[PDB]
């Protein structure tokens, strides 16, 4: 009938998340360019989301196909449901521990005791938080996990409480922190970017000024604006090999400022002491900070459009899940179950959306997937 087009639509969704997600795990592992804590999470997230594709998602087709009668042994219906919420709790935990992590960095300035396993240590808490949450599925699992001979999370309380714990507080939390980070990190840009205007403009005046005292009043602020940038160079956590080069860059290019301040003592060589238009060093810190701003504005676009698609697709299922129990007396739960049947597969296809966002908006992801698709290393 009409269902003949949508019959296998689930299988497209099982095929995309079991594969296209899988490459994301491959790509982050194989290519050294994508070795970042915020692209580390995505790999872990991708496992949660992939694991859901090859474990939970197959049985939902078997059950949808059987008429929703439970086909398997009754003792294993409290397990398929367990993985499903675990992974789905794990999946949103990864997404919300990407904004709690990335909001943290703009609030708190900085030494890294643990280095590049700041993520792997974080990640384990993301998973072990979600395994903690899902202990109750098998704790009471073996009853209240069957309704009219279908495998269905029928515990009224877990349905209600566990919709917030694994959806509305994680997703609320991330929405809040995603937008505070954007506004905050939009602001840092303007503050840092307006310094190089000050540095260049104030250096224009020193260049074309014939009063020694004018240069003194003019070049005084060059130290200030350079320092403000120095304080404000972005976290992007803070790696051990890159921040020293900025320290040397800031310090080494501060010498030009500081030295030219003396030559205060006195204008013959003041004009030419601050000629950091001759020095290679000064030119790099523009490029290699101004790139670093644009590599955070791109990541925020992807994360916004990954957060948003994940919230907007799981939200139907959870809103009517609660409705199944918050409107127990008045709703028609042949209809709510019908609606619930289909809002999980709206939601189950947020597990495929991630890799497509990456290829669409990350040139590094795009190139590797085809190379993995074509089997090139
Ligand atoms: C059975 C319980 C633990 C529920 C979770 C399922 C299992 C399979 C979980 C437990 C801990 C998880 C791992 C924790 C550590 C890492 C390293 C990290 O950089 C990426 C994900 C990865 C590789 C996870 C993969 C999935 C994983 C092994
Ligand atoms: C996409 C998102 C916003 C979906 C929101 C779904 C929630 C708010 C709504 C949408 C569909 C709704 C159900 C639609 C139809 C019925 C049948 C009726 O006899 C009882 C109410 C009941 C069961 C509604 C309960 C509330 C409900 C579950
Ligand atoms: C149609 C019947 N099925 C299929 C197993 C469900 O109701 C599953 C149970 C859900 C569920 C209940 C209660 C709390 C929760 N947290 C996270 C989920 C969750 C995920 C959610 N999965 C997607 C489907
Ligand atoms: C659903 C069809 C699967 C097609 C796979 C496409 C690319 C082929 C890659 C291998 C699939 C399984 C990967 C397991 C080893 C991953 C390698 C690694 O990440 O270190
Ligand atoms: C920007 C958007 C980039 C994502 C590319 C498209 C990804 C798939 C989007 C959603 C489709 C799934 C919705 C219902 C699935 C039906 C089964």
Mark whether 143 and 276 lie in a shared domain: no
Mark whether 127 and 18 lie in a shared domain: yes
Tokens 């504005």 — which residue? 297
Mark whether 180 and 192 lie in a shared domain: no
Contact 232, 288 (CB under 8 A): no
Radius of gyration of the chain (CA): 27
At 150, which helix (H) or strand (E)? Answer: strand 150-151
Tokens of 340: 């619930």
C-beta atoms surrounding 67 within 10 Å? 9
Q: Is 34 left (phi over 0), alpha (psi -120 to 50) or beta?
A: beta
Whether 301 is covered by a domain: the verdict is no
Whether 334 is covered by a domain: the verdict is yes
Contact 181, 106 (CB under 8 A): yes
Whether 210 is covered by a domain: the verdict is yes
Is 47 close to ligand 1, i.e. is its CB under 6 Å away?
A: yes
At 147, which helix (H) or strand (E)? Answer: strand 146-147
Cα 80 to Cα 243, 246, 372: the distances in Å are 47, 51, 31
Tokens of 244: 């020293």
Give 151's DSSP letter: E
Whether 167 is covered by a domain: the verdict is yes
Residue closest by Cα to atom 19 of ligand 4: 26
Compute the distance from residue 245 Cα to the ligand 3 centre, in Å.
Answer: 49
Cα 205 to Cα 208, 209, 211, 212, 252: the distances in Å are 5, 6, 11, 12, 22
DSSP labels for 218-261?
HHHHHHHHHHHHHHH-------TTTHHHHHHHHHHHHHHHHHHH
User: Would you call 135 exposed, middle or buried from its count of C-beta atoms within 10 A (0-12, 13-18, 19+)?
Assistant: exposed
Tokens 């970042």 — which residue? 36
Mark whether 204 and 123 lie in a shared domain: no
Is 327 close to ligand 2, i.e. is its CB under 6 Å away?
A: yes
Compute the distance from residue 82 Cα to the ligand 2 centre, in Å.
Answer: 25
Mark whether 266 and 129 lie in a shared domain: no
Task: From 218, 168, 184, 216, select the one nearest 198 (Cα to Cα).
Answer: 218
Sign, CA dihedral 311-317-318-319, equals positive
Whether 121 is covered by a domain: the verdict is yes
Whether 298 is covered by a domain: the verdict is no
Q: How far is Cα 239 from Cα 235, in angstroms, rounded to an integer?
A: 9
CATH code for the domain of 205: 1.20.120.10
Task: From 50, 53, 47, 44, select the one nearest 124 (Cα to Cα).
Answer: 44
Is 335 close to ligand 2, i.e. is its CB under 6 Å away?
A: yes
Residues preceding discontinuities in the chain at C–N > 2.5 Å? 110, 142, 236, 263, 266
Q: How many domains in the chain? A: 2
Is 25 close to ligand 4, i.e. is its CB under 6 Å away?
A: yes
Mark whether 180 and 195 lie in a shared domain: no
Mark whether 224 and 119 lie in a shared domain: no
Cα 158 to Cα 76, 79, 98, 138, 216: the distances in Å are 19, 15, 26, 12, 70
Task: From 21, 43, 124, select the one nearest 35 (Cα to Cα).
Answer: 43
Neighbour-count burial for 212-221, b at 16+ CB within 10 Å, e otherwise: eeebbebbee
Tokens 């200030």 — which residue? 224
Q: How far is Cα 1 from Cα 39, in angstroms, rounded to an integer?
A: 43
Mark whether 69 and 176 lie in a shared domain: yes
Q: Which domain holds residue 212?
A: 187-289
> Which residues contact ligand 3 via a Cβ below 6 A?
81, 84-85, 88-89, 152-153, 158-159, 162-163, 166, 321, 340-341, 344
Compute the distance from residue 33 Cα to the ligand 4 centre, in Å.
Answer: 20
Give 74's DSSP letter: G
- φ, ψ for residue 299, nearest 5 deg: -55, -40
Mark whether 153 and 168 lie in a shared domain: yes
Cα 125 to Cα 41, 99, 185: the distances in Å are 12, 15, 26
3-state secondary structure of 351: coil
Residue closest by Cα to atom 4 of ligand 4: 19
Give 166's DSSP letter: I
Task: From 29, 126, 35, select the one nearest 87 (Cα to Cα).
Answer: 126
Beta partners for residue 150, in sequence order: 147
Ligand nearest to the CA of 64: 3
Cα 75 to Cα 61, 78, 80, 81, 289: the distances in Å are 19, 7, 10, 12, 58
Mark whether 171 and 197 lie in a shared domain: no
Contact 91, 45 (CB under 8 A): yes
Is 346 close to ligand 2, i.e. is its CB under 6 Å away?
A: no
Tokens 């120095």 — which residue? 230
Whether 104 is covered by a domain: the verdict is yes
Tokens of 247: 């320290």
Mark whether 256 and 341 lie in a shared domain: no
Task: From 193, 90, 176, 179, select the one nearest 134 (Cα to Cα).
Answer: 90
Compute the distance from residue 21 Cα to the ligand 4 centre, in Å.
Answer: 10
CATH code for the domain of 158: 1.20.1070.10
Mark whether 247 and 199 lie in a shared domain: yes
Task: From 129, 92, 124, select the one nearest 307 (Cα to Cα).
Answer: 92
Which segments of the chain does DSSP mark as H helices, in order?
Answer: 3-7, 9-30, 37-66, 77-96, 99-107, 118-134, 136-139, 156-163, 169-207, 212-232, 243-262, 270-273, 280-326, 333-348, 353-361, 363-373
Indicate the resolution in Å: 3.4
Residue 58 CA to its chain's centroid (Å): 27
Q: Which atom of ligand 5 is nearest to the CA of 10?
A: 17
List the determination method: X-ray
Ligand nearest to the CA of 37: 1
Ligand nearest to the CA of 316: 2
Q: Which residues contact 64 (CB under 8 A, 6 or more apart)?
A: 10, 341
Q: How far is Cα 172 from Cα 303, in angstroms, rounded to an integer?
A: 15
């Amino acid at each position: 009938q009409e269902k003949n087009w949508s019959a296998l639509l689930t299988a497209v969704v099982i095929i995309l998340t079991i594969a296209g997600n899988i490459l994301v795990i491959m790509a982050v592992s194989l290519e050294k360019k994508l070795q970042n804590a915020t692209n580390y999470f995505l790999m872990s997230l991708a496992i949660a989301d992939m694991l859901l594709g090859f474990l939970v998602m197959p049985v939902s087709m078997l059950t949808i196909l059987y008429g929703y009668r439970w086909p398997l042994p009754s003792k294993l219906c409290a397990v398929w449901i367990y993985l499903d919420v675990l992974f789905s709790t794990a999946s949103i935990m990864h997404l919300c521990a990407i904004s709690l992590d990335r909001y943290v960095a703009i609030q708190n300035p900085i030494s890294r005791f643990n280095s590049r396993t700041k993520a792997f240590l974080k990640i384990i808490a993301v998973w072990t938080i979600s395994v903690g949450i899902s202990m109750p599925i098998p704790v009471f699992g073996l009853s209240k996990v069957f309704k009219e001979g279908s495998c269905l999370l029928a515990d009224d309380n877990f349905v209600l409480i566990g919709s917030f714990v694994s959806f509305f507080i994680p997703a609320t939390i991330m929405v809040i922190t995603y937008f505070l980070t954007i506004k905050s990190l939009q602001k840092e840009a303007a503050d840092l970017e307006d310094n190089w205007e000050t540095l260049n403009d104030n250096l224009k005046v020193i260049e074309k000024a014939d009063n020694a005292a004018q240069v003194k009043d003019a070049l005084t602020k060059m130290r200030a604006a350079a320092l403000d940038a120095q304080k404000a160079t972005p976290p992007k956590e803070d790696k051990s090999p890159d921040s020293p080069e900025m320290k040397d860059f800031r310090h080494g290019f501060d010498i030009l400022v500081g030295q030219i301040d003396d030559a205060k003592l006195a204008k013959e060589a003041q004009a030419a002491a601050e000629q950091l238009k001759t020095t290679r060093n000064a030119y790099i810190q523009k490029y290699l900070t101004m790139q670093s701003i644009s590599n955070e504005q791109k990541a925020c676009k992807v994360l916004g459009i990954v957060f948003f698609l994940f919230v907007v697709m799981w939200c139907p299922f959870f809103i009517t899940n609660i409705m199944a129990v918050i409107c127990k007396e008045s709703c028609n739960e042949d209809v709510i179950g019908a609606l619930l049947n289909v809002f999980v597969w709206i939601g189950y296809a947020s597990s495929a959306v991630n890799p497509l966002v990456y290829t669409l908006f990350n040139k590094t992801y795009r190139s590797a997937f085809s190379r993995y698709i074509q089997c090139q290393y």
